[PDB]
Write an enzyme that holds these catalytic residues in place. Structure first.
Site, PDB file in Angstrom:
ATOM      1  N   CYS A  38      11.642 -70.818  -1.255  1.00  0.00           N
ATOM      2  CA  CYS A  38      10.456 -71.452  -0.693  1.00  0.00           C
ATOM      3  C   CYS A  38      10.554 -72.968  -0.797  1.00  0.00           C
ATOM      4  CB  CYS A  38       9.166 -70.984  -1.367  1.00  0.00           C
ATOM      5  SG  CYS A  38       7.709 -71.686  -0.566  1.00  0.00           S
ATOM      6  N   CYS A  62       3.406 -73.828  -5.484  1.00  0.00           N
ATOM      7  CA  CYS A  62       2.120 -73.399  -6.016  1.00  0.00           C
ATOM      8  C   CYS A  62       2.269 -73.009  -7.481  1.00  0.00           C
ATOM      9  CB  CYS A  62       1.560 -72.236  -5.200  1.00  0.00           C
ATOM     10  SG  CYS A  62       1.205 -72.662  -3.482  1.00  0.00           S
ATOM     11  N   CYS A  71       2.495 -69.145  -8.469  1.00  0.00           N
ATOM     12  CA  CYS A  71       3.371 -68.249  -7.717  1.00  0.00           C
ATOM     13  C   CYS A  71       3.773 -67.031  -8.541  1.00  0.00           C
ATOM     14  CB  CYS A  71       4.621 -68.999  -7.259  1.00  0.00           C
ATOM     15  SG  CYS A  71       5.804 -67.964  -6.360  1.00  0.00           S
TER      16      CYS A  71
HETATM   17  C1  LIG Z   1       3.679 -64.725  -2.423  1.00  0.00           C
HETATM   18  S1  LIG Z   1       2.938 -65.146  -0.825  1.00  0.00           S
HETATM   19  C2  LIG Z   1       4.368 -64.878   0.257  1.00  0.00           C
HETATM   20  C3  LIG Z   1       4.207 -65.450   1.662  1.00  0.00           C
HETATM   21  C4  LIG Z   1       4.206 -66.973   1.772  1.00  0.00           C
HETATM   22  N1  LIG Z   1       5.073 -67.554   0.755  1.00  0.00           N
HETATM   23  C5  LIG Z   1       2.788 -67.524   1.666  1.00  0.00           C
HETATM   24  O1  LIG Z   1       2.518 -68.450   0.903  1.00  0.00           O
HETATM   25  O2  LIG Z   1       1.878 -67.057   2.349  1.00  0.00           O
HETATM   26  C6  LIG Z   1       1.908 -63.685  -0.502  1.00  0.00           C
HETATM   27  C7  LIG Z   1       0.422 -63.941  -0.737  1.00  0.00           C
HETATM   28  O3  LIG Z   1       0.130 -63.867  -2.117  1.00  0.00           O
HETATM   29  C8  LIG Z   1      -0.758 -64.907  -2.472  1.00  0.00           C
HETATM   30  N2  LIG Z   1      -0.562 -65.302  -3.874  1.00  0.00           N
HETATM   31  C9  LIG Z   1       0.396 -66.153  -4.353  1.00  0.00           C
HETATM   32  N3  LIG Z   1       0.237 -66.253  -5.691  1.00  0.00           N
HETATM   33  C10 LIG Z   1      -0.810 -65.487  -6.068  1.00  0.00           C
HETATM   34  C11 LIG Z   1      -1.383 -65.240  -7.306  1.00  0.00           C
HETATM   35  N4  LIG Z   1      -0.894 -65.820  -8.400  1.00  0.00           N
HETATM   36  N5  LIG Z   1      -2.468 -64.390  -7.389  1.00  0.00           N
HETATM   37  C12 LIG Z   1      -2.968 -63.793  -6.248  1.00  0.00           C
HETATM   38  N6  LIG Z   1      -2.389 -64.044  -5.022  1.00  0.00           N
HETATM   39  C13 LIG Z   1      -1.326 -64.879  -4.933  1.00  0.00           C
HETATM   40  C14 LIG Z   1      -0.464 -66.052  -1.516  1.00  0.00           C
HETATM   41  O4  LIG Z   1      -1.610 -66.831  -1.257  1.00  0.00           O
HETATM   42  C15 LIG Z   1       0.016 -65.333  -0.271  1.00  0.00           C
HETATM   43  O5  LIG Z   1      -1.030 -65.245   0.669  1.00  0.00           O
HETATM   44  S1  SF4 Z   2       2.384 -68.921  -3.047  1.00  0.00           S
HETATM   45 FE1  SF4 Z   2       4.477 -68.773  -3.945  1.00  0.00          FE
HETATM   46  S2  SF4 Z   2       5.754 -67.951  -2.239  1.00  0.00           S
HETATM   47 FE2  SF4 Z   2       3.812 -68.683  -1.288  1.00  0.00          FE
HETATM   48  S3  SF4 Z   2       4.274 -70.827  -0.651  1.00  0.00           S
HETATM   49 FE3  SF4 Z   2       3.355 -70.964  -2.732  1.00  0.00          FE
HETATM   50  S4  SF4 Z   2       5.151 -70.946  -4.140  1.00  0.00           S
HETATM   51 FE4  SF4 Z   2       5.920 -70.224  -2.127  1.00  0.00          FE
END
Ligand SMILES: C[S@@+](CC[C@H](N)C(=O)[O-])C[C@H]1O[C@@H](n2cnc3c(N)ncnc32)[C@H](O)[C@@H]1O
Ligand code: SF4
Ligand SMILES: O=c1ccn([C@@H]2O[C@H](COP(=O)(O)OP(=O)(O)OP(=O)(O)O)[C@@H](O)[C@H]2O)c(=O)[nH]1
Length: 279
Positions: free
Chosen positions: A14, A18, A21
């Site tokens: 990525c 965040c 993550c």
């Molecule tokens: C891991 S992301 C993968 C797709 C892409 N990286 C994105 O940001 O949309 C999948 C979803 O999980 C959410 N997410 C990430 N971290 C999270 C957390 N710690 N608790 C709950 N949801 C989370 C994100 O907002 C995203 O919509």
């Molecule tokens: S939530 Fe995690 S996977 Fe999605 S953009 Fe942020 S760092 Fe990347």
């Protein structure tokens, strides 16, 4: 168990950071499109109807993503093909080529303040989000939002934006603490600082009672209600045990039983819905 909705996290890589993550960039492996067409075809006959292309950032691999979503739709005849994006790298020419085969596009934005996005880990803006919605209208794609309710944004009033933006599906996740991903200093991330209480989350959901599309997911329902596929195409257990063997080397049945999947929370959080591009 029949794997109706599958989340294929084909890469962990990525370009955002965040703080919370829970699918960190622990490895840079991505499957060959030959082996991925094995698993998705193997998973189609097993009962899969919706596929969700997630991971780290899927648009970092636009050729792989483009080949699969075409394969999943045209030849696999799959009920619904989804993608989850942060939105930075989405471009219109991609939706020109493949938008015929995208059924749901899920852009995740956690705040509309550039200041809050900075604290959470998105540098920047929101004009991109409104742009992707415009594209989704042009190419007949269903547009949904995914926001994470955490310490920084749990007090925000996002109604005015969501009336104009108007998604059919709006998920609000209470921050999850996946053990191994974001639960200690040893791991790539640590999300414990951004945790909020049950009532803090409910104030957020109750504040947006005007939103019909709002589908909340506390830690009751999000933890163990998903079918997660590694970049190595193996189901991930979120109950405690180690991941299954790859569905490429063992097949779907053996892999699914090696993982706990709570179908009751799956149905409670709205896992089955009108996910097709029609009706
Ligand atoms: C891991 S992301 C993968 C797709 C892409 N990286 C994105 O940001 O949309 C999948 C979803 O999980 C959410 N997410 C990430 N971290 C999270 C957390 N710690 N608790 C709950 N949801 C989370 C994100 O907002 C995203 O919509
Ligand atoms: S939530 Fe995690 S996977 Fe999605 S953009 Fe942020 S760092 Fe990347
Ligand atoms: O422990 C977990 C739990 C969940 N997740 C990931 O959080 C992501 C949340 O993303 P979504 O909630 O949008 O998945 P979905 O597309 O299948 O939902 P519907 O269309 O059926 O409404 C999912 O892709 C899931 O794999 C993890 O990465 N780890």
């Amino acid at each position: 168990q029949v794997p109706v909705s599958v989340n294929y996290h084909f890469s962990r890589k990525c370009n955002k950071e965040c703080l919370f993550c829970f699918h960190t960039a622990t490895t840079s492996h991505v499957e060959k499109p030959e082996n991925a067409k094995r698993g998705l075809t193997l998973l189609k006959q097993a009962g899969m109807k919706k596929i969700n292309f997630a991971g780290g950032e899927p648009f970092l691999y636009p050729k792989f993503l483009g080949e699969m979503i075409d394969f999943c739709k045209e030849t696999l005849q799959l009920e619904s093909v989804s993608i989850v994006t942060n939105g930075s790298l989405v471009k219109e020419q991609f939706l020109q080529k493949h938008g015929r085969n995208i059924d749901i596009l899920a852009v995740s934005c956690d705040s509309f303040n550039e200041a809050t996005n900075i604290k959470i880990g998105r540098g920047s803006n929101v004009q991109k989000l409104y742009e992707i919605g415009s594209w989704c209208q042009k190419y007949d794609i269903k547009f949904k939002l995914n926001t994470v309710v955490n310490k920084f944004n749990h007090l925000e009033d996002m109604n005015d934006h969501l009336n104009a933006l108007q998604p059919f599906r709006w998920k609000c996740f209470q921050v999850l603490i996946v053990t191994g991903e974001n639960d200690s200093d040893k791991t790539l991330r640590n999300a414990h600082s951004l945790t909020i209480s049950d009532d803090e989350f409910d104030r957020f959901c109750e504040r947006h009672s005007s939103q019909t599309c709002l589908v909340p997911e506390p830690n009751r329902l999000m933890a163990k209600s998903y079918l997660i596929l590694d970049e190595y195409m193996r189901f991930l257990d979120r109950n405690g045990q180690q991941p299954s063997k790859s569905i490429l080397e063992v097949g779907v049945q053996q892999a699914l039983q090696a993982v706990f999947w709570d179908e009751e929370a799956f149905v409670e959080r709205g896992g089955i819905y009108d996910w097709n591009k029609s009706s």
